[PDB]
Amino acid sequence: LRPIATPYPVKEWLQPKRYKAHLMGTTYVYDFPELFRQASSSQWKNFSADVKLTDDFFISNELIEDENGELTEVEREPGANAIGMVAFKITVKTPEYPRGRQFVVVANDITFKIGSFGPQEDEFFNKVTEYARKRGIPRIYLAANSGARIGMAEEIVPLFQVAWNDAANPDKGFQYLYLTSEGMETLKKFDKENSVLTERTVINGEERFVIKTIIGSEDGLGVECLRGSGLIAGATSRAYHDIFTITLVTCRSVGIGAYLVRLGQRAIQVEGQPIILTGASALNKVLGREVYTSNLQLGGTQIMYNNGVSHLTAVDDLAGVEKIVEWMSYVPAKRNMPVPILETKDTWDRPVDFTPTNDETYDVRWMIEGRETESGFEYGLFDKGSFFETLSGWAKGVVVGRARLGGIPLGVIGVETRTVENLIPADPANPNSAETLIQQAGQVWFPNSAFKTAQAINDFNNGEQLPMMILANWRGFSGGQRDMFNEVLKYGSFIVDALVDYKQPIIIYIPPTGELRGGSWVVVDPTINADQMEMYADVNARAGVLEPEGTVEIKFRREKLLDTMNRLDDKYRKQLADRERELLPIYGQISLQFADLHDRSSRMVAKGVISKELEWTEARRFFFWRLRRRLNEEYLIKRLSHEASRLEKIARIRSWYPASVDHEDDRQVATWIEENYKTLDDKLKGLKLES
Amino acid sequence: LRPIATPYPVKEWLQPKRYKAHLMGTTYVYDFPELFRQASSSQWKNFSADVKLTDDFFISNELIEDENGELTEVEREPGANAIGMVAFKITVKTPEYPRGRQFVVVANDITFKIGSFGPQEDEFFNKVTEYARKRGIPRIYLAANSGARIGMAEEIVPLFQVAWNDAANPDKGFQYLYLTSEGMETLKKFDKENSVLTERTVINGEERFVIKTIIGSEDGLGVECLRGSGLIAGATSRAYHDIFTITLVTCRSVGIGAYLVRLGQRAIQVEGQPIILTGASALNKVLGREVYTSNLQLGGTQIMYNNGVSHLTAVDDLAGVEKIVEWMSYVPAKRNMPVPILETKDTWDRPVDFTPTNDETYDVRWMIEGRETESGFEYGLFDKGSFFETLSGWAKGVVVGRARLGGIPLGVIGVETRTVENLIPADPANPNSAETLIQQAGQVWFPNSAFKTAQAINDFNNGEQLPMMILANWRGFSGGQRDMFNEVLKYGSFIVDALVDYKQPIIIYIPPTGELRGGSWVVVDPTINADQMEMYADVNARAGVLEPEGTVEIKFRREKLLDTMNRLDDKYRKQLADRERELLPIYGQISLQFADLHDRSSRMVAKGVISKELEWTEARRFFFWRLRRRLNEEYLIKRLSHEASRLEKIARIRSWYPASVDHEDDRQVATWIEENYKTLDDKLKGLKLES
Ligand SMILES: Cc1cc(C(=O)N2CCC3(CC2)CN(C(=O)OC(C)(C)C)C3)cc2cn[nH]c12
Ligand SMILES: Cc1cc(C(=O)N2CCC3(CC2)CN(C(=O)OC(C)(C)C)C3)cc2cn[nH]c12
């Protein structure tokens, strides 16, 4: 025992495995539920400081497989795990779910066989994933591993013989490896008969049993670990489309561990903990040369957070847990449950303070969450303090995160107007490679920002099951050679595919000072998914096939300009070229304003390509009731689905509204539905007996 | 008329639009059905030279919208199209479908308003896509366009007035644009009243109608073209998952046209025809400098074929059509129809001649399709002349194409063992940018090859609805810094996602000289999709978590080596370090062979991670009956699905087999099912009345 004379018992001594985990730079597996309790408790303090919490607000039960291989809840002492994979079912009362919400936490035990994945770990992880999926509850994975378990048939090591070319000279080589009849008998004695595949021969009176295949008696040596790896890869891929999946990389994550991080999609990387495929030393051995210095050079946050593999970084394990808990606060308690409403001090009924200007540079986050000024706080479109940005280290041209609109959680996509630089590090394997700095213009989709946009759309849809708002402000895609070669078309197409798959309401809003041109409009038009999408343009937004300069270049040419001087200029109506030379600068501007007068929200309304033109200051009030109304109608459409189109379903639901309700008034419709949920339920139940 | 005195009529004069299309370097739209007839006729000649074709073997009917907007077949003279989008329903008797197969061909008319997409073109394209989808038939798109239609309100051009700052000095600027009461009256006269949005004011007795928004009387000017663009983007995204989709880029393809190429996925690019987003000239205007020289520098085959955007290139339009027709020959006639069997001279019953060797370099295509040698033709695994390679210009480390196995069409994925170089061109926008040459090791998945593998899997599954074979031979993924930074994990994960979605039989086969290690095995294990996947290893293949060198480094260390000399070496059993120094080279090799003896197909069978170990020479005979048996059982499983698991369904089907049939004999099972299809149908019909 060390240290001696401590006020309370030494936990690292009571359970020596706690100390091993600490030595390896991570939280001991059985101490993670405590971090969840701490993080959950902080969630309450930051929400309502006055709240009194008892310990019944949080329950953690370890899940273990029974005799029949069925998962069951147990209360046992930490460190009694027979396998290197552990799980807990957590029930927590949270501000969003005061009566309680559940989730499963699966974790590798880094103290058990270096946190390697053997077949039993692989089968348990899969069983826990299925348990979560069946229940529709979130699956949190805590990665601290060494990848697939590696081994050799240790019993064949002290028994094998080598059939030398020349017994006297071993350096002359060998023909094969074999067993003596004494060796075979050792195996027959210990029942490990099937540990080898032998072909018997006779060489100089001696009977040799030639080793044709070494199998081993111990399970978890090779290909059986790889089968399990593939099994848990498939399971995680499936879970991502079914439940909320998140991973915290808490110590290193290797091989299958790295793939699991990615297949679960949403990931938080603790600083200094690498996500690697093959270690740096092994790569150097393969390369001959000493190319790489460390594993963090390969999979640190400097790589993975900049890649977009890691959605967020965390200073330590508790910060990682706090981030999980915060992310979860926007997510339904279980699959197909409503999005968790959480109204705070910042209510729906207020105008939007922060307003962008054409003449002044801004951070889109100010339009989202507001900004601190010397003269007080300027409120943005969403609730103060509700913006939770993710994928912040990658493709910084698009801003993605979760927010709240009068308590309603949703995913937000905004456009960074400022030029963005990214540093491509120098390739250690190429001596003629130097670090490159890429600069990307604002309001233009590039391969990385198009990929991030599509990724965001998918991560909001799958598991999170959230509505979304896109503050659409793009000039188009980078049409240049480098970006065309870097497959900008491929990533742009993923955006369309993500919108087609979207199952919750979408609001596309061209904000003030915002634009949407040819290429950018195509990829975000509400006709991509009419069932879920609707578009709105601010009165101070612009949209058209080309930018005005482009339109004038194709349709307001010199002949048309001169015919305009020959109409508007008295003096003009070699004596001409002197007049032309003085008028062209202003007559250029006149055509440029003529083109711009077509690019207005009023044209968009006239042509019926947008639902409404809006005033930025009044957007929060409008979107709160439009979103609330939309969630209520969507609920009614889902209930009716228990064989008709959406158009027929919504017509039927709206035929139930009193004759006096204006179908175009969002507040009235939302208010009526909420006042009549049980009445509407009775109606629905009456229709069920009619099918 | 020119030329004069030709033997037959001058078609380019009879229809002047034919000449315009030719001048622009493309086939005239109405002449494409003829290219399909020519290509289809060649298909027959290359199959059976003796066949006699009449003109009834091929029918092409133009599809046009009727009064109610419903598509109908018409016989009219070319060039009578009121819109710039045309379609044909083609019915062709082919070697695979001698009684006929159908498909729709949609094409832009480059002679109609430069092949721009206006709302009517967008609505027609969408109607044709829906027509194809409803019928389950392939949709061929021929791209020859200028993107979304651009325009201005031409009627407001001769009427607008400018409200100058100083009437005498125009160069001093202006305040707004306006209309006179005479201008307003011109609009009122021609009914174009709603062409402008005006706000009336009085300035110096004069009544000015200030232009607040220019709308226009003509449809197809701006945002209405963008709405249609998004509509056809969504439709194509959807079609790709539903029917066989292919695009031939026959003249330039711009903006929405470029996205359509990509959303349809499968594309053939005619040499010299660019796929661009923004033209080179417009980019230069935006850039200030003269950065780009041509549109082919941005979207030529040098870009798109090297990207993998273009699956194939074609010398001219007929070569493009021939490639469509050849690709289609592997595809079912309509959605959910069986894969088209086409038995040729090269029958199933033969061994595989071409065999790879460890000591000798080979082209994987020889293992696939065979090779010509001086001593005659060495047959490969698949039918002679059946390999149709696609994505040949991109990520040349993986070989992807369609082939036939005794007539059965399937998708093939093979590993290029040779080192692959690719040339990244120099960025014209960066003066400090020089062309880079990347070299990639064989048998290693890199970001591009992992992406190509996933892409291949998806393109075989969607629309093509084919079974697949992967000749799995990878050491793993590139774990190095450059490839980790270039998101190798992301692309590796797409492989898993593609396999999870696979709906047809899959065969994973580790070939002779082939390997599958830690990282590579995870992503292709049959437990990712147990319902469709099965794995096989050649007797001369290897598999384990690490390569032998890796295994020895972790589990056969110095203490273990010395304990082996202290057991096997009489002389060994400062007098030691001299012995150690002489024995370590051979004792290294002994441990290296000890590790390798675990990496065998016999271990794979023992541990039950593979279905069977195989002999390469006998693989064609085995896979032909295994695949045939699998297609028959899959058919029966689909019929039974008209509420149980797959395991229950296949148990039921196999309970119908006579007691004497061996469920493990593929040939016997396939033979019995094919002899009893109608008998099994009767059984199925009897069960229907029991639900
Ligand atoms: C002057 C002018 C403009 C546009 C237009 O509408 N653009 C918007 C889309 C872009 C291109 C200009 C901006 N994007 C771009 O790559 O910008 C980078 C900053 C290079 C990354 C593509 C069309 C035309 C046609 N003729 N003259 C035009
Ligand atoms: C010697 C040795 C080998 C392996 C092994 O199994 N590898 C297979 C997978 C690779 C890495 C070596 C090959 N890949 C690679 O990047 O190869 C490039 C050519 C660089 C592109 C990753 C593991 C270990 C562990 N200790 N010592 C090892």
UniProtKB/Swiss-Prot annotation, chains A, B:
Outcome, altering Y259F: Does not affect catalytic activity
Domain CoA carboxyltransferase N-terminal residue range list: 7-343
Positions of region (Carboxyltransferase): 7-642
Consequence recorded when altering E515Q: Does not affect catalytic activity
Domain CoA carboxyltransferase C-terminal: 347-642
Binding site for CoA: R252, K555, R557
Binding site for acetyl-CoA: A148, R149, I150, G519
Cellular compartments annotated: Cytoplasm; Endoplasmic reticulum membrane
Induction annotation: Repressed in presence of fatty acids. Repressed 3-fold by lipid precursors, inositol and choline, and also controlled by regulatory factors INO2, INO4 and OPI1.
Further information: Present with 20200 molecules/cell in log phase SD medium.
Subunit description: Homodimer.
Function: Carries out three functions: biotin carboxyl carrier protein, biotin carboxylase and carboxyltransferase. Involved in the synthesis of very-long-chain fatty acid synthesis which is required to maintain a functional nuclear envelope. Required for acylation and vacuolar membrane association of VAC8 which is necessary to maintain a normal morphology of the vacuole.
The name this protein goes by in its record: Acetyl-CoA carboxylase
Native species: Saccharomyces cerevisiae (strain ATCC 204508 / S288c) (Baker's yeast)
Gene name of this polypeptide: ACC1
